[model samples]
Target chain A: LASLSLGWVIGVDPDIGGAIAVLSPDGSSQVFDNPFVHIVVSEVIRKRLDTKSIIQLLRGLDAPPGTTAYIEKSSPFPTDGKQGWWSTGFSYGLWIASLVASGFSVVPIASQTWKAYFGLMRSETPKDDSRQAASILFPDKDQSLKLKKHHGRAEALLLAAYGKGLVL
Target chain B: DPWLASLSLLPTGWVIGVDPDIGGAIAVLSPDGSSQVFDNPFVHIVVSEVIRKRLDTKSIIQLLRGLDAPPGTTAYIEKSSPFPTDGKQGWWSTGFSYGLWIASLVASGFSVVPIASQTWKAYFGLMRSETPKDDSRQAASILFPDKDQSLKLKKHHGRAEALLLAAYGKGLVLPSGKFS
Candidate 1:
């Protein structure tokens, strides 16, 4: 939130349920869901990436394509085999394609690295730590940062903030 | 005999040749020289600033693994890579398309065979024709004349490539596009 000399920064939690947060040069910010779509197939609901929407939003970020987009590094669940890895690989590639096409440079930060930066305390619901940490970092957005569901946005903000410090 | 020996591993039972592109196809040649071709499926999403086309990998997997059943579904994929000029999006898409097939095939417990364009096309004498696409199509058309409807479209060149590749993998016809 402070001392970030970057023209602007984007933080992305690239999972299907995750969020994207952007920090502008004048200290303004915004957040959005990852833009994956939900649909009915054989009367069952399935989620798939909305790469079209993803590109649309990223390209219109009001900043130069040279902006840095810091993403939480993606990893596969150890127990899930090739099927799990396939989706992860596709998601990762989509992120790369969209970001690269928009002229944004990408940087990946490990989950542990960002968590350590936030000094997040381990708990049963470890994911909540990012939400709590994001609230403290951007107090003005605290009301919007409540609930575990907002953690994706929280982590995106935290990721940008973490990368924010590294730039200067 | 040289071509047969060069196959590294000969496929048995059913042979599926995959032309892995947005407009490509899947050609399944039975052990008896009968064949079927399924054009690759795509989902189109066009919006301002982006035009995205996604290959339906699931549908592709279904065709590759389910011509009734598996355990000996040998797939010969047309191995490919993007040129540097394709940039990031094209490169990512190209690699994703190829890898998804390999992963899907392996995950389905099917064996995979990758045939380079140079390797297979030369073996089929497609290397000599300037209009290789039509040449390949004509070659395939003669081999499976009933597929004329499928190969009629200009873009169905992929279908021709896949059909020829499947024929090669099956080793059922001479490269003259004639049944041996």
Candidate 2:
């Protein structure tokens, strides 16, 4: 019976077999499964998880309470299949916006809504002028000057985004 | 259309109503020269939406196709290794990728508004303590120091997963303290 349970446990969550054995002597119940399970289920599969991506997305909403514009550019697959790039929940927003752009016109009834409209979610309509919400994510003029000193396109972009109101 | 071209030539007359969800929708490439082209005009708005959605790889590709950019652009959605992902092959590096894309959009003739993520609510909830850093932040930061680790970041991806769970217990708020 132990061997049979061990094999089943190995198949389901082989990564945590040792830990599972210690926690569940008979190998039946599982309270935790090495953060990977949560990564997929809670963050990826469940469609709504309070991960880093969520924080950045929501932070975009703090824009200065104005009716600003938003343009969506999405590539669902990223051509190859690395997997990690798609997990941030941005694609989920693209899906909803696409649905609306395609004439679905239904309200987003899922947590994914929070992921896409980070700054706009704070506004009463799409016309609000609160570009500051998105602006906060990027670097300021001072930071941009500092990044340029390092020949860092990455840092330069980060700063430019803030100056140009990229995130909010 | 010539009329649209004329509009483009204007100093900044077009009040393009850019969506805050720009991060996920665009990719920018300087190509070492050639006037530093902007692949997606409204990138900041689009990328933001992608980050908020927490979409899978396939869904992200679909969103790319939905945009006005050329179907042949292969940098972002090409889908090779080095990018972070779960065992199921979902892209996790999208947050950073979208971040980069927003810069290009701003250079173009577009304007944008940023949206907040649900995680903000969770962060506020978890802020009940003096420090908001959860176990995930400590773990992932050690594993993946760089924000945009395509392949390496996956190893430490567990950090974000744990943090999200803790944040969920804290609770979230709409744009304002009140629920939207």
Candidate 3:
């Protein structure tokens, strides 16, 4: 296995309220809210899920060379449900496309693999186990990652940690 | 010659108006007072070329042709000023594309009307403001009061302006006579 010191590692949760996390070699980390700005027009409306902005922010982070990104792959929608399921698909494609265009080596991480790697499982309600795991992993910086909506943030942190060989 | 003169005298023709900005709109008003609105077609030109990135003229031409307006029909284009060198990066591209559309319309046998922004707004009784607020949408709604239509978001403003430009062509509003 390649050493975690190979390069800067970034993890992204591309859901509407998701976030992107960047973990530096020095163990410093930062998180940004996922894109949600909507530019509505008569003929067609476009969401400001800007990949350009993401690349610009990543560029500002002066991490080591060969920065790589790990983005959560989209899962199939639940059957027998017909509402509020298509918009995520649209955003998923944009996130992947933008990341690909950013000239970085992007790796698609499945939800089950990351959850299992961290010894977490899906819950009936929204999952906080990922957040709990993230807090334990970075106890010194736990308070700084506090967010109103922290699930996506936790998932992003874990993805980066997984890339850094912190998760067994 | 007499038949052609009589045909020109009748108000039985179409009025097509185009707003050439990136987010601009195109409107077509039939002689029967029916109208439809369309967004100006544009392609992102992330490449090296003489005209690098702006709205396309062929799509506008195709949309205008969809109206099937006969010869002598008047096509009105809102007069847009040239973007200064220090202006937005792609602003000049809009003017370049705008000129192409005007030339295409003239060649397509439509009498083009290049009316100023204030000319049509004052003719429609809109107040001058840095932000028109909802005046353009309100003016459009007033012009087509009987038509059952609702625009998504605030896109009504561009459509409304195009409608008024066509109204200028329909002779419903008198021009302020400032040519660009």
Candidate 4:
């Protein structure tokens, strides 16, 4: 208690629908959308992950060296096919690489286990389910998850909580 | 015989070789045999002590396009797998590099060929060795004689591996003396 808490979970939901959630053991949480920059890739405008914004965010979530973090396992959706697979792989890989590069211990959690941790059974609108659960659990003063488009933020928070609970 | 059969049946269009390591390389051999090689594009991060570079997907697609290789050109990329000692980040970077090239190649309309390092390296008699860096250089020089000056230095190993992959795809076999 001399300075700050060293044990916390930095959970990330990566890809275009990417966001990060920093969960404290005391239940307070902070959320952020993963940073990206727009650039032309093969004549089409594309959004790409950049480093500085990530470093800034990581520095804030900086815990003791080898801080524990959790990211949901990234795997191909049977229905998503090729395009989705590759993009998701890129995001998943970079996020892990970025985390370790920042001196964090990354534990990849299975989606099925965490998805069920919150009693979330709605596969139809899985996004909506996470939004509801995170909203109720983290009903703090910060209006971070008010918008429906903040599903990424919602998933990230849920992931953080899942990791926190597991650790406890 | 396997090399002979494949060589005679090689395609007519331009071929590209991509080595997908963090600081890898890519090379394109045109229909007329004129070729160009480039370092695998990456966005370097200064704060990273473990990973200095992560492959840049956009730059890769752009570089492939700029190679003047038309859509549907074939690209041979070495397969990727993690070593037993690879830490989590190493595993992540490995898959990331592999994934980026796959998507980038598809995005650029190039047919992707996943070749094992052993399969292709053995074809050229480039066995696994301590100095595969210089080994690749020698093989590359022997295959592309005019490009020897560029591949002379040790650091150009990435370029050399990329070139040999391109050469392999272009149906050139390196039955070199150094194989002994």
Order the numbered candidates by lDDT, best leading.
4, 1, 3, 2
lDDT of 4 by residue, A1-168 (tens): 000111588878877657988876666778888877675648887765543455457767746556677788766555664444455666775566456545566777788888888877547788776787888878881277777788899888888888778421
Top-lDDT candidate index: 4
Give a tens-digit lDDT track for model 2, residues B27-71: 222223111111222221224334333323223333434444332
TM-score, one value per model: 0.50, 0.18, 0.43, 0.52
Give the candidate order by descending TM-score. 4, 1, 3, 2
lDDT of 1 by residue, B1-180 (tens): 222222222232788788877778888877676789888866764423578775655455555456753545677888754565653445545655665555445444456677888878877777766788788788788778889888887888989988888887877554432443
Off by over 4 Å in 2: A1-66, A69-72, A82-85, A88-168, B1-180
Worst 10 residues of 2 chain B by lDDT: B11-20
Tens digit of per-residue lDDT, candidate 4, span B87-180 = 4445555767875565456445566676888878888878858877788998888878778988888778888888888888778877636563
| lDDT tens digits by residue: candidate 3, B28-79 | 8887768888877766654234344455444555665676567677778887
Shift in Å, residue B98, candidate 4: 5.4
Question: What lDDT does each candidate get?
Answer: 0.68, 0.27, 0.62, 0.70
Task: Mark the 10 consecutive residues where model 4 chain A has the least summed lDDT.
Answer: A1-10
Of the candidates shown, which would achieve the greatest TM-score relative to the real structure?
A: 4
TM-scores, chain B, all models: 0.83, 0.20, 0.75, 0.83
True contacts kept of 3: 0.00
lDDT, residue B83, model 4: 65
lDDT pick, better of 1 and 2: 1
Q: A91, model 3: CA deviation in Å?
A: 1.6
Error of 1 at A104 (Å): 31
* DockQ for candidate 2, C-alpha atoms: 0.05
